[PDB]
Design a protein around this ligand. Structure first.
Ligand SMILES: NC(=O)c1cnc2ccn(S(=O)(=O)c3ccccc3[N+](=O)[O-])c2c1
Length: 289
């Protein structure tokens, strides 16, 4: 709207998609989050070719400061660029819309839960490897994801895994797994959170590593829910007692060791994503398919 700083407006120019270049099919919803519903759309680029996109309508913006923060991040997130991270194609201002590349196979969790598919143990470990490669990138940019999970990674038509659900695309795409803190009101995916994050609400790249370990366990169970018989808030106690996710039936031992390392109670003794890329590449390499 009109109250926006013009210099900020000028700084975001290169992110902004104009209505003439974007066709959104608003009659069908393909995805839903908290902050908006998601629709298929086509983006006319330089050449006049249709880029297939997922377009999100941000429904809960109430004031102009929220919009400015939204543009400010748009500018940051547009510079991010890795094969295993979901890119931002841009934003439509003229509801604001977030334009993302369309991901043919949807979120990684629904993909592996879908019983018509048979991803092998090698394929599953490959998906995890790809996640670690994108997280390696993000961490190199000293960006903390805070909500890494298989529901928040996407899969494209070539089965490239894209880490998603951060920046302008950040949402709860499955609200079942988020709780509210008694004394701060933040929305917490508790069963993916590191011990320290549950105790002191502090997030770091090493707490991204904890979540990555839970994500690997998701892969090895083909998307079973973690701690099914541990209630949301009994989880801190469960972990503080020195207990962890059990090894999945078809999880190879060396990968379970990787997981367990990811959940070390000392953030600093957890491996880095660069070490996870190395070690998981090795594990992936020892399978046939
Ligand atoms: N729902 C879809 O078919 C679809 C296809 N492609 C994309 C690309 C992004 N989304 S999303 O926003 O809805 C989404 C959906 C679930 C998890 C995360 C994300 N994310 O991009 O952050 C997509 C959704």
């Amino acid at each position: 709207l009109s109250a926006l700083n013009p210099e900020l407006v000028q700084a975001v120019q290169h992110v902004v998609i104009g209505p003439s270049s974007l066709i959104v099919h608003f009659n069908e919803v393909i995805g839903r989050g908290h902050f908006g519903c998601v629709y298929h759309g086509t983006l006319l680029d330089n050449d006049g070719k249709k880029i297939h996109c997922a377009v999100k309508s941000l429904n809960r913006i109430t004031d102009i400061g929220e919009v400015s923060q939204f543009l400010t991040e748009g500018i940051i997130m547009k510079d991010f660029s890795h094969p295993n991270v979901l890119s931002l194609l841009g934003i439509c201002l003229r509801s604001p819309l977030v334009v993302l590349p369309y991901m043919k196979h949807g979120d990684l969790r629904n993909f592996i839960r879908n019983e018509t598919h048979n991803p092998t143990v090698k394929d599953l470990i490959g998906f995890g490897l790809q996640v670690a490669k994108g997280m390696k990138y993000l961490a190199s940019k000293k960006f903390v994801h805070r909500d890494l999970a298989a529901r928040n990674c996407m899969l494209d038509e070539k089965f490239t895994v894209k880490v998603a659900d951060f920046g302008l695309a950040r949402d709860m795409y499955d609200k079942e797994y988020y709780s509210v803190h008694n004394k701060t009101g933040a929305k917490l995916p508790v069963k993916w959170m590191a011990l320290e994050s549950l105790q002191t609400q502090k997030f770091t790249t090493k707490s991204d590593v904890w979540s990555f370990g839970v994500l690997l366990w998701e892969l090895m169970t083909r998307g079973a829910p973690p701690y099914p018989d541990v209630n949301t808030f009994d989880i801190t106690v469960y972990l503080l007692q020195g207990r962890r996710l059990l090894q999945p039936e078809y999880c190879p031992d060396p990968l379970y060791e990787v997981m367990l390392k990811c959940w070390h109670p000392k953030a600093e003794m957890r491996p880095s994503f660069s070490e996870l890329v190395s070690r998981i590449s090795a594990i992936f390499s020892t399978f046939i398919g």
